[PDB]
Design a protein around this ligand. Structure first.
Ligand SMILES: [K+]
Ligand SMILES: [Zn+2]
Ligand SMILES: [Zn+2]
Ligand SMILES: [Zn+2]
Ligand SMILES: [Zn+2]
Ligand SMILES: [Zn+2]
Ligand SMILES: [Zn+2]
Ligand SMILES: [Zn+2]
Lengths: 148, 104, 76, 159, 76, 149
């Protein structure tokens, strides 16, 4: 259960970040049940979004596998919960850790990007009709991301 | 792949590898100006690409150099045994010497 | 005031600044202690991506606050 | 050629240049594992020959590299101001910036090029430094305190 | 045990030994700490050049005695 | 400009004296050093106190210090003029070396004379062919010239 992972685990278990919860499964030490909170001044205020994070055999030399297991109206996140994020989408660094990944996911919620989209339909509405797209983001937050 | 061992006093951040998170085995430094294990950074240039992991700056097989200065310094840090009831302390350098003649 | 910053590796640096310091300055003072150029830094605080022009007081950062450093949002 | 400056705590020998015996200015490490100031070692290659001064190994202009990790830790070392009454500490990095506005520093005059403490260069307009520009009391004309004697020709203010 | 050695530059280091150690392996402990290979070291004590064959107790070295290290390229 | 190197070295020589080596700068010239080294233990020269004179050229430390014995000494590597045949001072000097390391080597040289690389040829010849006589004269020269001064 390689050393890099173990140290990194107990490092973020002792230094938990505001509104990010990440715990390994009792069974598999590489599978992390994650919840990130809707950030300050975001469309997703008061929201609690679950995530399935997993460390591949390659790690840390390759990026982790990450999905949103809660539905969220967001131009960089598709209907399957797959995520368009620089870190684990493409150019990755083995310096990076779970901590930094999860922060960057949080940072994605703070800055939705229609100009670098995955959900092509959402980003279209997000660019031309910001107001409504934000209201729908809030509505999806309220329907899916509370009391779960 | 870095020096996995109980340091005492515990390993300071300057001798820790950003990639593996352990004592810098055969440490190498970038011209960018940071440190990695020879093995670890060389794997980062194999797979993650020709970049420094900590800056997204240019980095090639060629311009890595060995921070031999750092490497001693590291081997001069005192460490404990890793077999069960040992509790002997020593300079890291002779950990392998002692674990040949160790108790448990 | 002294404020905490967590670099990529996870270890914690502490920096002396005042609330009328720009983020620009914080990244410059991070560069001096870690060699990461200002371009290549992204500071996150309370889940908010901090911008260069604006100040610590514009995001109401206080004494003993922990900034988190990551790498540049180069979307792809 | 290195950093000549009072460190407190005093400089640990690991950052000491074995040639000039100071804090490593633009520090460079050798392949044999040696720390020098770029300038110093490059003279040691010029005049003493192509070798590391400490272990007698072979060395050249090319194969030395800058120890950027060591240089930054160097500039983070706390040091004291080098003007007289300073009594203040800072990181080596901002010694230059502090010497601009040292409370106890000495600054030559814009007007009299007599050196003057920074505290008193503020007070060196009102109390005349010898080329300071007086305003005539009871006639209102600008002249340099050097040339008073000749302005006493011109207080015959018509109407 | 725990002897002192003054390198070329002035640094004073400490080396754990036992009296029945050779000068050879002392010169090895210098190399590990200071990078200078044994061939280029010359060890002095009370004005005598210490020879590679003999032991520390053969020169009456003791607790806390300071050896002095200098350089070679001799016979010139 | 009294280069920091020299200064830093000077106040360490006074503060951390090497056993049986005294070195002080002249009251006039900071680069000129009145030195006294002791005749080392079990040597020909034991009981001796030898004056030397060491001078730092303006090149220093990029060139070696120039040192000579002022005291008369029967030794194959020291001539009548007090110049010393010791490598440090000849070629392949190193700017890492310091005054301490020079003087320590001169002390060492007294313990370990070298007839094979001579300067006083008459003395070295004596030293090779008839060592016991040369060594006994060495103790006498020590005795006559290197005590009570
Ligand atoms: K260091
Ligand atoms: Zn590593
Ligand atoms: Zn053991
Ligand atoms: Zn230097
Ligand atoms: Zn070397
Ligand atoms: Zn000051
Ligand atoms: Zn003036
Ligand atoms: Zn007038």
């Amino acid at each position: 259960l390689p050393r890099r992972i173990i140290k990194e685990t107990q490092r973020l278990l002792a230094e938990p970040v505001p509104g990010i919860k990440a715990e390994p499964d009792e069974s598999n030490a590489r599978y992390f049940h994650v919840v990130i909170a809707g950030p300050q001044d975001s469309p997703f205020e008061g929201g609690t979004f679950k995530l399935e994070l997993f460390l591949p055999e390659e790690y840390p030399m390759a990026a982790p596998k990450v999905r949103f297991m809660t539905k969220i109206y967001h131009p960089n996140v598709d209907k399957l919960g797959r995520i368009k994020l620089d870190i684990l989408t493409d150019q990755w660094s083995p310096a990076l850790q779970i901590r930094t990944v999860l922060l960057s996911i949080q940072a994605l919620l703070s800055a939705p990007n229609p100009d670098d989209p995955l959900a092509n339909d959402v980003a279209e509405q997000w660019k031309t009709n910001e107001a409504q797209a934000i209201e729908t983001a809030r509505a999806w937050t309220r329907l899916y991301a509370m009391n779960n | 792949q870095g020096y996995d061992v109980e340091f005492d006093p515990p390993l300071e951040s300057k001798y820790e590898c950003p990639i593996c998170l352990m004592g810098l085995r055969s440490a190498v430094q970038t011209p960018c100006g940071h440190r990695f294990c020879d093995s670890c950074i060389r794997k980062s240039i194999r797979d993650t690409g020709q970049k420094c992991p900590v800056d997204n700056e240019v980095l090639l097989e060629e311009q890595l150099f060995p921070d031999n200065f750092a490497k001693r310094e590291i081997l001069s840090l005192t460490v404990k045994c890793s077999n069960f009831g040992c509790s002997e302390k020593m300079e890291l350098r002779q950990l392998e010497k002692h674990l040949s003649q160790c108790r448990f | 005031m002294q404020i905490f910053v967590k670099t990529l590796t996870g270890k914690t640096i502490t920096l002396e600044v005042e609330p009328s310091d720009t983020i620009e300055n914080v990244k410059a003072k991070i560069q001096d202690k870690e060699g990461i150029p200002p371009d290549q830094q992204r500071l996150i605080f309370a889940g908010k991506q901090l911008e260069d022009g604006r100040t610590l007081s514009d995001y109401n950062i206080q004494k003993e606050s922990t900034l988190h450093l990551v790498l540049r949002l180069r979307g792809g």
